[PDB]
Homo-oligomer: 304 residues x 4
Amino acid sequence: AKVGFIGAGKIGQTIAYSALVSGAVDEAVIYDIIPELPDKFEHELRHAFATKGIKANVLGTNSLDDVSGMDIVVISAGKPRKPGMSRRDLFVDNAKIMIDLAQKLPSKNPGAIYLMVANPVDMMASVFMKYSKQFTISAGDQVETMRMRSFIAKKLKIPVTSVDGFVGGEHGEDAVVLWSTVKIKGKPVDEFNINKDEVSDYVKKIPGEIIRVIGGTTWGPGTIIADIIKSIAFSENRVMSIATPKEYEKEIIHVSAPTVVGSSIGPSLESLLDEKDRWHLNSAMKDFYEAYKENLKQLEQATK
Amino acid sequence: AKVGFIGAGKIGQTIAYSALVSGAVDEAVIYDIIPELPDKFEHELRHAFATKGIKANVLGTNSLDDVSGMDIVVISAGKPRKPGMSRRDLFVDNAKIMIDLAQKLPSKNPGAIYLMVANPVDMMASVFMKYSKQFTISAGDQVETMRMRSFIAKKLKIPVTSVDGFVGGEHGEDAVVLWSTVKIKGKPVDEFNINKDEVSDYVKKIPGEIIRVIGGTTWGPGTIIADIIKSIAFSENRVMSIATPKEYEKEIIHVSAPTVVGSSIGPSLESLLDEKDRWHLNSAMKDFYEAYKENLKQLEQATK
Amino acid sequence: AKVGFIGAGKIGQTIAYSALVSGAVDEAVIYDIIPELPDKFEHELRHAFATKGIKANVLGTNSLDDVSGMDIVVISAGKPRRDLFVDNAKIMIDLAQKLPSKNPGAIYLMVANPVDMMASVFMKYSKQFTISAGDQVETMRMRSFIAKKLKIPVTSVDGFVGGEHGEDAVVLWSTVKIKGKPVDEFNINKDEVSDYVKKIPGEIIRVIGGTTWGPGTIIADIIKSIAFSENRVMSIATPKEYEKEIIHVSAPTVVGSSIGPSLESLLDEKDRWHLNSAMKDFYEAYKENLKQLEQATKA
Amino acid sequence: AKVGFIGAGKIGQTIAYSALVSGAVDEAVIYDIIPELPDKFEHELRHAFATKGIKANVLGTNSLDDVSGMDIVVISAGKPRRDLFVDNAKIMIDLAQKLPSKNPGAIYLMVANPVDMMASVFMKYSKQFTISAGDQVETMRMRSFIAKKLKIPVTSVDGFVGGEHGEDAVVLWSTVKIKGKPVDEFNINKDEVSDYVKKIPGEIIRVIGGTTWGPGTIIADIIKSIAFSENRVMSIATPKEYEKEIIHVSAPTVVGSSIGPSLESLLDEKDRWHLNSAMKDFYEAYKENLKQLEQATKA
Ligand SMILES: NC(=O)c1ccc[n+]([C@@H]2O[C@H](COP(=O)([O-])OP(=O)(O)OC[C@H]3O[C@@H](n4cnc5c(N)ncnc54)[C@H](O)[C@@H]3O)[C@@H](O)[C@H]2O)c1
Ligand SMILES: NC(=O)c1ccc[n+]([C@@H]2O[C@H](COP(=O)([O-])OP(=O)(O)OC[C@H]3O[C@@H](n4cnc5c(N)ncnc54)[C@H](O)[C@@H]3O)[C@@H](O)[C@H]2O)c1
Ligand SMILES: NC(=O)c1ccc[n+]([C@@H]2O[C@H](COP(=O)([O-])OP(=O)(O)OC[C@H]3O[C@@H](n4cnc5c(N)ncnc54)[C@H](O)[C@@H]3O)[C@@H](O)[C@H]2O)c1
Ligand SMILES: NC(=O)c1ccc[n+]([C@@H]2O[C@H](COP(=O)([O-])OP(=O)(O)OC[C@H]3O[C@@H](n4cnc5c(N)ncnc54)[C@H](O)[C@@H]3O)[C@@H](O)[C@H]2O)c1
């Protein structure tokens, strides 16, 4: 696929690297406001390509106009999410960038899927789509999903390949494990000794721990988000807990549920979950709506 | 995954090769009735492994008892399907083998998924599960699905990665394209100039053409079926038009629909298709039931 | 790489399959004299491609004229001794007249047997740079055997088989290393190894047969090493000048976007010796085979 | 392979990431002095693994004692001239006392700078077979540059950079080949190439910096070539005897389950020459650096 990267920070680069080396991206244009960053990153990529035999086309640019004719545009531009900053405050910071980008990118990229990575990620997507009018998904809880899976694996001392299931609903600390999806060696999770609350708060707390010690989350989200790009690029039909647009009284919101991801997206599979999880998902919609609507009002004091 | 192969014919070997070289299989036991075939195939595999650095464990055997402790058992043992032989006649040939195998394998392989490849494939699976009592899926119409996709790609002169969708229902000539799933560059299929009947009969006729000229179908089905094994082994959650057991008045039948395939299978996604395709799927169930029930009666003159 | 395949039977299909799913081949043209076989093989490839997201352009053809513009041409066209040389050298001489002017600058890789001898014939008549698969397969057979014998991973065995092809090949024991360590430090019945190499193909052939998966994958890896410019040392048979004629003998050779050098000079003295015996013996047998061909007469 | 990683910063994390998702590393132990960094890095790896189905065992540790039983040890522990040698040679001398008795039979791969010099120090004191990443990165920089300059795929450029590390490295022009053909047949400003190699890291470092993706991937490929026994020729710096001391100079070298031979003997005369200048110059500078270290005094 031809993929455009808006943001060449830590997560931008990890995502780009990982999707380029897997083959999911044959052609990429990489954009940032920082002068000469895209260019130097491109040199890095080209050196990495030599040892692998990768002939993919790559352009690092400081000119937004060079991002045109893309199939997918991955947006990771924005201030990071450190503990002590509320969702509301980050929203106020970062929505500006999305509103700006909504005015420029759609012009140069006709049928492009927009993939949001910048936080607060599902809210960033809802805003970007509100103003861009382009189809926009959020990476959502696919990362959370893989965190849950690896944790259950280490705890039971089994390979991760024996764990199935999804985290969904709202992003980050508001995420919920969809327990009706979770299976261990193919069997209901209730047959095993696992403490659900422990799993749930590992998932919610680990990104904060990682940021505290290292300064940022990269290898995990960047591979996981690159695997989303790959399932689109290769039309793999992987079910992923990304967040897709839904109409709700009657604004557009994004919430995560297991969704079929291929050359086309989706459908989402919320209708196939048990009662408890459909309930948690409904609740997530109500709460997202409330919070997002409020933040939208606040922001709209973009005075005079 | 630890995978057992019952049948080391042309399709057995292609499936085994393809799943071993992808990494989906770390451990395999390969079984056939033909003396020394498994053994010589194992030598071949080991030579192939040297150049790739593959350390997977492989055992070619003529003793059925060596196939134990497997996660997945792939059954491709049986006489092939040549034009001029009815489904009924092949059923009568091949059900015998499945009934035999249903009596031996479950004993040595506790929690194993059984994957049917031998034809008539969905009927072979229904019989194998009837008598083995083990969870059994059929490769179903996943091959048909990939045939449809590549045909639409060549006809429109686009990459296959821009085509999404599934074939389902009954196997082979009775398959139906699920048109509500089919999208080209993400858009409804009705927006493009494609002749649906042409696509449908390419899918139905091409395996016969290939068998006529070459004597058998291998590279296509064997990679496609190896990708099913891979989505189980790596817990990828690829949606695939395999055939899973359903209870119908109230015998167990297998029919294909898009199904989530991971470490756990599924659910199937028939409830999310449009009306026309849900109808075609219901019809497929009625017809399979009728035909399978009749063939079961016939076979049951296993006299005295 | 753009790769043309001459011969779409068992070994040609395997190599073409393996090289396409590894991503080493961007574009292929596949040719056979059997009517509609390449067409149907192309169909099988396209169905396999759909599941992997592979978008390489592939063309099955019954018209040799359609094989043009390639980077590498792989020749596996063959008929089922010495007679064997004559029978198949005619195929090569006919291809030698056709391929070069349609494939400016292409490299040729010989697979059809007798492989070293057929590479030599084809380069004489075509005048194009031609390599033979040589003893790379045997090399991998040797490594596979040692590793199974010592219950270790095949990734802990290093080494090459070289010289002549097939039952005349020699194990180059100064290259063989277990866990990074000289072979003489270990429990290795050399005769048992060398013997497994010579006999295992005949055994596979008898039961199956012949051989597809092993040499298909191994030879596809030569194509990969060329196409990705990996510089893998492999014991292919490259062309060498000897007594005014061009011959093919297998030795460890750097295989990249450029092919060479050979590494015979870096071997120990006994191995350098067996390789000279091999060049001499191959020359004699090649000229004796050329003679019996020159009986190409007009009744 | 079982691979231990000493240093889990920017370059150590990258190499460890790349080697694990390539499947070259079955098992890793990762160590750093920064408290809780390896633990958190291990968490990040596990989340990445879940999406790919990778099941390699990985351990982040703040206890060096936990790095035992490895096949390969990769050292990227470093402090941010000549002073640079002294500062980091202390790290190496301390590791030299600890690692060998816990890692019987392991191979060591030096990444921390000055890389050739640090490999040499560490093998003197540890007495273990030690290689340096050397000029493999530069080699890939050279290929990347030519190919972008001539608008061709990087897979059509072959060649190596060798001798000393970094700004003292030399392009080995007799190895450089475009489309399988001698470099002198093409439009190549050599000074422009050599100059791009020396200056591009400093430029990446200034803007970013420093360098992760490029050398991370390139060095992970050395690990891969060892672990899968691929026999890729790479210009790493292997140990050579010179004036009773052990030194590291980069040359094209076969890298497999066993490491070697070097290929300097197969170069042209000018390149053989620059490599001898390089061994001499590296010796002098290494002994001058050893001297200033031996001022390890007790106030
Ligand atoms: N799982 C996830 O969804 C996930 C994971 C990691 C990071 N993130 C989020 O992604 C964002 C980036 O994280 P990071 O580590 O890369 O931060 P970073 O500070 O490294 O990089 C952000 C980059 O964005 C650029 N930028 C800022 N405004 C821009 C604009 N208008 N146009 C183009 N570029 C612009 C900056 O120049 C910088 O290089 C944050 O919001 C973070 O919380 C999300
Ligand atoms: N898409 C698909 O589902 C697909 C594709 C190709 C082939 N097939 C089917 O798979 C079956 C095999 O096709 P093939 O090309 O490999 O045929 P084949 O004749 O090459 O091989 C079948 C093998 O099964 C073995 N066998 C027979 N009975 C056995 C028993 N009781 N136990 C163990 N082994 C036994 C034989 O010894 C033989 O080696 C056929 O029924 C064919 O129609 C299905
Ligand atoms: N290690 C090796 O190098 C190795 C391994 C296996 C086979 N081989 C050799 O390769 C050859 C092919 O083996 P196979 O197993 O594929 O046998 P095969 O008989 O299945 O294949 C031969 C194919 O070549 C085609 N062919 C014959 N003459 C031709 C011509 N003039 N032009 C185009 N196509 C032509 C035939 O139609 C047939 O499809 C044999 O000579 C075999 O000995 C070499
Ligand atoms: N091509 C190459 O060979 C190449 C490329 C890049 C970097 N490097 C070199 O590698 C080194 C690391 O670079 P970086 O970018 O990762 O820097 P960095 O500062 O991010 O990483 C250094 C890490 O090593 C750890 N460390 C320091 N002393 C240690 C000790 N005694 N034991 C264990 N860990 C220790 C530090 O805590 C830190 O995490 C530098 O010397 C750099 O010059 C070499």
